[PDB]
Amino acid sequence: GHMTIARDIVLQESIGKGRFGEVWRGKWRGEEVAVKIFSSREERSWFREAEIYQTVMLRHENILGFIAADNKDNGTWTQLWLVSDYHEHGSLFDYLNRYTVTVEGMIKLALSTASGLAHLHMEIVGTQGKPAIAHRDLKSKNILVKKNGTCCIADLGLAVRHDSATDTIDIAPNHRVGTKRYMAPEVLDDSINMKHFESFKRADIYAMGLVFWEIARRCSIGGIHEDYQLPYYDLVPSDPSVEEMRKVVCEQKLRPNIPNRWQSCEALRVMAKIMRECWYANGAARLTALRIKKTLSQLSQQEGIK
Numbered sequence: 001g002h003m004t005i006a007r008d009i010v011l012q013e014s015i016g017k018g019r020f021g022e023v024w025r026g027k028w029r030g031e032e033v034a035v036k037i038f039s040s041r042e043e044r045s046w047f048r049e050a051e052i053y054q055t056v057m058l059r060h061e062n063i064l065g066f067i068a069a070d071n072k073d074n075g076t077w078t079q080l081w082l083v084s085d086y087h088e089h090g091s092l093f094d095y096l097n098r099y100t101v102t103v104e105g106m107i108k109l110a111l112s113t114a115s116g117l118a119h120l121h122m123e124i125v126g127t128q129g130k131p132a133i134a135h136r137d138l139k140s141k142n143i144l145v146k147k148n149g150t151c152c153i154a155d156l157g158l159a160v161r162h163d164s165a166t167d168t169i170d171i172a173p174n175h176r177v178g179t180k181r182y183m184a185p186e187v188l189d190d191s192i193n194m195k196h197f198e199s200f201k202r203a204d205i206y207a208m209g210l211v212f213w214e215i216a217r218r219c220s221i222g223g224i225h226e227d228y229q230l231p232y233y234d235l236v237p238s239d240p241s242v243e244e245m246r247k248v249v250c251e252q253k254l255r256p257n258i259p260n261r262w263q264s265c266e267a268l269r270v271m272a273k274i275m276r277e278c279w280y281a282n283g284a285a286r287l288t289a290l291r292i293k294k295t296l297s298q299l300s301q302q303e304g305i306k
């Protein structure tokens with residue numbers, strides 16, 4: 001026995017509630033792991049997540065490290081488990097609510113998010129290839145922060161995978177999946193062409209722009225920073241409906257406000273420009289995750305980030 005298995009894991013602490021199923025911190029062979037538990041009737045959701053996390057060549061420093069899918073029978077019922085790396089800081093949402101970040105800190109968070117999304121989006125054709133994957137629910141609550149101050153993308157359960165050879169998506173995609181607040185304009189107004197996989201990648205980029213705005217607000221320079229807020233906190237109620245979002249994003253054409261103080265700092269001017277170029281209503285005009293990664297890599301190099 002060398003591989004990680006559920007019978008050898010001891011749950012220690014409740015740490016979150018997933019889309020479906022509960023999240024715990026557990027100990028496996030002296031190490032801390034995260035465990036997400038589903039009931040037997042949630043087998044479809046558990047299986048789909050296990051399937052995405054088992055995708056060939058998925059592993060990357062900025063994608064949640066998956067360990068195993070398993071079952072655990074306690075003698076009364078069977079639990080369906082997913083086991084992954086554990087990150088003490090939790091989500092980027094938790095981290096930004098708790099702390100302010102330095103310019104260096106902000107670039108680290110943004111660059112790592114873009115690098116993880118670029119890998120998710122990347123198709124590798126051939127032998128041990130990799131299908132392009134679109135997230136469909138990117139947001140700050142779905143990104144974790146590591147001890148080294150970098151991010152890893154998580155909550156891949158709603159992802160869609162593309163097969164290049166047949167130009168097909170692995171599932172029959174349902175309309176308007178995802179957190180309403182982060183839905184792209186084309187998803188909100190249902191103009192999205194769900195037969196073109198590039199449509200999904202473009203919608204992820206819009207959501208990434210919103211996450212970058214959340215990070216930038218928390219960047220503290222000379223003690224100057226904004227308070228933590230979710231995108232559109234100023235325009236929509238908590239738990240907004242598709243109709244509430246559509247009226248703001250599609251009809252009124254509003255985006256999160258880019259404050260004047262972001263023009264005084266080079267790192268913030270770069271971040272603000274990226275946000276604007278993620279927020280275009282026309283998905284085809286948006287930057288790619290790879291282009292953003294390149295821009296932010298050049299910036300981190302200029303700042304001398306360790």
Ligand SMILES: N#Cc1cnc2ccc(-c3c(-c4ccc(F)c(Cl)c4)ncn3CCO)nn12
Pocket residue numbers: 015016017018019023034035036049053064066067082083084085086087088089090091141142143144154155
């Ligand atoms: N809080 C916290 C914390 C600290 N480290 C981790 C790692 C993961 C998760 C997690 C999972 C999950 C857990 C086990 C798994 F095998 C898989 Cl495939 C997913 N599903 C939702 N979350 C909430 C964060 O988005 N939470 N988390």
